[PDB]
């Protein structure tokens, strides 16, 4: 089981940095097995789903990256419009190194 304190902290901080504090009471994380995806978001239920099968492999920065990406879908919509990718780069200048560690971990054991 992944420590909830770490997840609560990253969620709160990312919501604050993405100027989504007005939606703070509605946004939550749920951990469950997902098929062919690391994370998803229910835009109606304001719920971020993290794949239970990959979560024990992730670093704290990787979790922060995943949560930032799903919240940017809540903020901007379905497609990675210019404003989406620039906000993601602003939070993660090392975006490229995060994604290579992310891919290597999805390859599993
Ligand atoms: Ni996306």
Swiss-Prot record:
Judging by the UniProt lineage, the source's domain of life is: Archaea
**Pfam short name (any one):** Peptidase_M56
The protein's matches in InterPro entries, at most eight in alphabetical order, are given as: Peptidase_M56 (IPR008756)
TM ranges: none
What's the family?
Answer: To M.jannaschii MJ0123 and A.aeolicus AA15.
Full protein name: Uncharacterized protein MJ1213
């Amino acid at each position: 089981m992944k420590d909830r304190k770490i997840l609560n902290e990253i969620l709160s901080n990312t919501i604050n940095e993405l100027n989504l504090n007005d939606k703070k009471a509605n946004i939550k994380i749920k951990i469950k097995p997902l098929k062919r995806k690391i994370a998803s978001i229910s835009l109606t239920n304001k719920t971020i789903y993290i794949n239970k099968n990959i979560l024990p492999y992730l670093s704290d920065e990787e979790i922060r990256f995943i949560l930032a990406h799903e919240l940017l879908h809540l903020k901007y919509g379905k497609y990675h419009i210019n404003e989406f990718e620039e906000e993601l780069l602003f939070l993660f200048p090392n975006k490229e190194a995060i994604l290579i560690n992310l891919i290597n971990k999805l390859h599993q054991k």
